[PDB]
Amino acid sequence: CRIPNQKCFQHLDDCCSRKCNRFNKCV
């Protein structure tokens, strides 16, 4: 699970929260 604020694409939100903000980073 990728940590918050980590550069992630909304198309492939690999975040732990699976949420990527407008800054193309995790949340």
Side-chain angles (χ1 to χ4, degrees):
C1 101
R2 188 111 134 272
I3 59 180
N5 73 74
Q6 210 71 1
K7 223 289 279 282
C8 59
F9 237 88
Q10 308 217 316
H11 211 282
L12 56 125
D13 44 276
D14 56 80
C15 314
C16 211
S17 62
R18 273 176 295 269
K19 270 276 276 168
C20 291
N21 45 222
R22 62 192 254 91
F23 312 110
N24 301 253
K25 269 179 283 189
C26 287
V27 190

